[PDB]
């Protein structure tokens, strides 16, 4: 029978800093065992200081991203050029997603940006709309690999303060963009070591009040 | 999941855990399972994440509209039947949600309704809902008494979630407490099981099936 779905691999990761947030994703696109492209971006700038990626079935991810940008276009039109805050973009997406609850967009999406107060923000969605704001989150194939790492290296879980008989948690400080990028790169190299779908390249979108900056690093191509 | 709400002298207690799972994968431990509808109405969630978040945020809207339309705050009975009738319209499509609509109104007093995606809507004083419900009931039922003090109530609801968080693989993260009174819901914190378990063990002297 016709199977309306497929899996194009890839993995994406988002991290929110104090006055920035990043949304990185690998650049490989596959099908079964073949590499479709070594460079096919899946993290995009949607205007209004909002980056989004919908990773999973590319057709769906693409459709989703398209419908959202457009939702941003019409938000401007219908509401006199008002800027779509990230919280609002999020809720909008929930609806985009949940509209297809009975023939889902087989994707795990994330958007990053700055909140109304200027602090970094990341939001992630279940293929049918569940969402929440978070400090960091990875999605896609190597999600299971990368996520634990971030809980540890970003949120300092299980790390306590030396010589306290494990009764005092490590001070929850906030990483700098530089450190975040180091983590992003490691999380990705690691993921490429162990996942056959992850590799080829890593594209990170950094978001600050100064707009959106793009950084690109090569990954293993095997 | 693991959620409870029970009625008593000082009001209603609503305690839920905060874990989200994708099968055996722990998707998150920072999910709010209680949606604050209006200053006197709480809705708890269990089942599909989206289904609950979505239809309960919606419930919130329909509640507001009623305010605008009738000038009076929506009753818990009516608030609940909306969700219920909604859900019943979708019966047979796969919605998955088990929830409790707790609230206080001058007319009904403290009230709790259980509404699930099968369309069962019921009124009662104690309901535990979710994969960890049995675990919660176990603890809840055995120490529950009507003449409980507000403080003891908080602790009990709290403890019951703790219980389920321990035994039920699918529950955990942290407990969120809520007290519903004559004057509205009062949030009583977010407690990380990571630390709550240990404190409770030492102070209470239970969970002896563990060493530490």
């Amino acid at each position: 029978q016709f199977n309306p779905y497929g899996d194009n691999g890839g993995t994406i990761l988002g991290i929110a800093g104090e006055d920035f947030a990043v949304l990185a994703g690998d650049t490989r696109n596959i099908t079964d065992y073949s590499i479709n492209s070594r460079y096919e971006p899946k993290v995009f700038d949607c205007g209004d200081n909002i980056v989004m990626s919908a990773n999973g079935f590319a057709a769906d991810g693409d459709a989703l991203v398209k419908r959202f940008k457009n939702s941003v276009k019409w938000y401007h039109f219908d509401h006199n050029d008002k800027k779509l805050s990230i919280n609002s973009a999020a809720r909008n997406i929930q609806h985009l997603l949940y509209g297809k609850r009975f023939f889902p967009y087989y994707v795990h999406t994330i958007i990053a940006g700055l909140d109304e107060d200027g602090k970094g923000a990341v939001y992630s969605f279940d293929p049918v709309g569940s969402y929440e704001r978070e400090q960091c989150r990875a999605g896609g194939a190597a999600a299971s690999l990368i996520m634990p790492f971030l809980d540890n290296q970003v949120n300092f879980k299980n790390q306590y303060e030396p010589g306290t008989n494990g009764k005092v948690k490590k001070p929850l400080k906030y990483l700098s963009v530089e450190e975040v990028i180091k983590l992003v790169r490691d999380s990705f190299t690691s993921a490429t070591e162990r996942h056959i779908q992850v590799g080829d390249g890593l594209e990170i979108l950094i978001v600050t009040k100064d707009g959106v900056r793009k950084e690109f690093y090569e990954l293993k191509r095997d | 999941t693991t959620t409870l709400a029970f009625r008593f002298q000082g009001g209603i207690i609503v305690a839920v855990d905060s874990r989200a799972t994708a099968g055996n994968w722990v998707a998150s431990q920072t999910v709010k399972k209680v949606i604050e509808i209006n200053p006197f109405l709480l809705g708890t969630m269990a089942g599909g994440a989206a289904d609950c978040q979505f239809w309960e945020t919606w419930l919130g809207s329909q509640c507001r509209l009623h305010e605008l339309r009738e000038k009076e705050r929506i009753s818990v009975a009516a608030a609940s039947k909306i969700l219920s009738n909604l859900v019943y319209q979708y019966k047979g499509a796969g919605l998955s949600m088990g929830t409790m609509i707790c609230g206080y109104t001058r007319k009904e007093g403290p009230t709790i309704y259980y509404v699930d995606s099968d369309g069962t809507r019921l009124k009662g004083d104690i309901f535990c809902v979710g994969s960890g419900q049995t675990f919660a009931y176990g603890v809840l039922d055995s120490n529950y008494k009507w003449d409980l003090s507000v403080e003891d109530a908080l602790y009990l609801g709290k403890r019951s979630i703790l219980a389920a968080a321990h035994r039920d693989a699918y529950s955990g993260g942290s407990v969120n407490l809520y007290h519903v009174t004559e004057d509205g819901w009062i949030y009583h914190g977010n407690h990380d099981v990571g630390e709550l378990f240990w404190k409770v063990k030492e102070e209470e002297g239970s969970f002896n099936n563990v060493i530490g």
């Binding site: 889902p104 | 399972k33 089942g47």
Partner: peptide, 4 residues
């Protein structure tokens, strides 16, 4: 589909 996340669950609870």
């Amino acid at each position: 589909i996340i669950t609870x």
